[PDB]
Amino acid sequence: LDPRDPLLRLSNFFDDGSVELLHERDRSGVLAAAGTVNGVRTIAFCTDGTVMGGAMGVEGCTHIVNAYDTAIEDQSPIVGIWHSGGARLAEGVRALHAVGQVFEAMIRASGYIPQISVVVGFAAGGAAYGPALTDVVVMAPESKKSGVCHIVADDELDAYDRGRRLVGLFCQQGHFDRSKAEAGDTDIHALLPESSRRAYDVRPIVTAILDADTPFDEFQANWAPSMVVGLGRLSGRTVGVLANNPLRLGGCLNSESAEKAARFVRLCDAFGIPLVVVVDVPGYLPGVDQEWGGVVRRGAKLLHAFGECTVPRVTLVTRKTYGGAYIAMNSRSLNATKVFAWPDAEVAVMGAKAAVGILHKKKLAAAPEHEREALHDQLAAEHERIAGGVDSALDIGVVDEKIDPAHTRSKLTEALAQAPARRG
Template sequence: GGGAYGPALTDVIVLGPEGRIFVTGPDVVKSVTGESVDMARLGGPEPHGRRSGVVHVVAETDDQAYESIKTIADLLGAQGSMAAKLPEVNLAGLLPESSKRAYDVHPLIEGILDANSQVQELHPKWAPNIVTTLGRFGGRTIGVVANNPLRLGGCLDSSSAEKAARFVRMCDSFGVPLLVIVDVPGYLPGVGQEWDGVVRRGAKLLHAFSEAVVPRVTLITRKAYGGAYIAMNSRSLGATKVFAWPGAEVAVMGAVAAIRVLHRRILADIPDDQRVAMELELAAEHEKISGGVARAIEIGVVDEILEPTVTRTALAQAILQAPANRGLHGNIPL
């Protein structure tokens, strides 16, 4: 019943294996709609952890639930202070050699955060194309928002934008600095996305970042295209600092997609068996003209190119040099 809104108004919901949350129970559902459903399928860990996004953490046992609560309370309540100099690792080794290969971003997040420290991912199964994690970085609590190319290629969609927006608002309300790891090809296209309110729900992420006053640093690892780049804590949204690794691409769209628009008449006249080769040739020329990350620095959308071997200290210094503010707002359940 209405008591279900109690947990929904809290900052973080941890659901144990026998936990159930629903506004109307199975009997009411059956009498009104004729649907037969049990309590677990209606409001248990699977629907709320994977489908609805109501629950932040699903625990397999009660003891695990208590441990998650302790970790979250410690990360938010005892945030600590950040060291100015951090031990470095070669983070490039955590990405595949080919820039076209998908990969799981979790090892990269673990490599950036302190080794063997407290970490708690929120909403791991809901909208997994973006990862939202609380962890320790240089001894201090930070919030990490990262595109995950392993799921939907890392595209933003309506659910992932809403998930990230809620996380950004929570971190801002608790004074937790943000690290945004960007590898995004754009927004997920499709009729379903438009009907699902990607404009309205995607705007939540832009609003959350633009209003956040905590230090928020962006790292572009491989690519940042189009409107999705803007939404991922870009310079235009007031990012504290935007770093990029060598070879990162910042553009309205990828080179191949761009030349298909710019040179569509030329490509239309090319025989089918030669079109792919011509596209690659035109794309290579386009990449030279667009200028890559050097051009991004020139026009002010990227502040500095970082080598993966010195990234951790540079990120820490950028956070330390920014004012340690805290958002003067509540934590609305977006």
């Protein structure tokens, strides 16, 4: 059989022997079917790369729409397998219309049933926008469109594999397990650099929080690299993680990271998936040139996403969190479920040196130039002794609890478990 055969593709995705066609096979360019993915009833459709290179037509789109109606009715996840040059030129406006009806079905399904796209071949035009409307896009390398693909697989087979795991993440979310959280506790603080000025990759910290032999399904690893987001399991339960990554742009927020974070927050909130927000961010940045439009607009959207969120969302401040960025990273003012801080964490308007340069500008300016750098450092030291600490923020109430980093897992799990499924 040709490798592009849609029944072959469907069969490699679904549980063995579970495939049930939803319609008679034809020359429409689409084959849709029901089946199971590790037991859970799932709907899927596959564009047929053997007919007109998978081009989307009236009858094909109609099968997709029927599959969507079926999935919506049964509340089943729906998975599309894509390989298609786009709309069938010969079918004219009729095909355009039919493609649009696919979009409208996906929009009706949005936030109601999970939608996973597995792009296994070239996908252009309507076949690029189709996946763009779904919740998670898995791409095989054999298939610039920056930020559109969430997960890059090794090949086609690995792509169905990640696709299958995603069905489990969304449809078998499970329960938190306090005993497993404690059993996985480690000293996560040890993963930080000795110097508080040195940059590090946050991912080992994310990995240490999540269950040990469970994959971290990171989204968009190569887009907006100053932000890390993705799905995993914490004591068996599906969680989404967001984490500033000091390794890139000093972990600062900017237009694309804010966009990446906001979309991820909205996706998890839509499906009842609780969030862990690992914060270590000194500030935020404009684009090339000094354009602030993006980070203002996207930043606002980030605020909106956390603000309206109802799933549990717990913040952990590892090292430092400053200013407006502090506010946007799931702060108490935006109704965070709980905010924890490691012992040596700093929560402040800005660095003590910068703070002092502003608060004592005139004293510093009026001081003799030779006594000045010493005066600045002395004032900073005294500022730092009364402002910035965890104990100050505790006092104000914007940090709920300072925690031993050896208890990060259990503490996080405990806070998430005590929150309602929906409120805040």
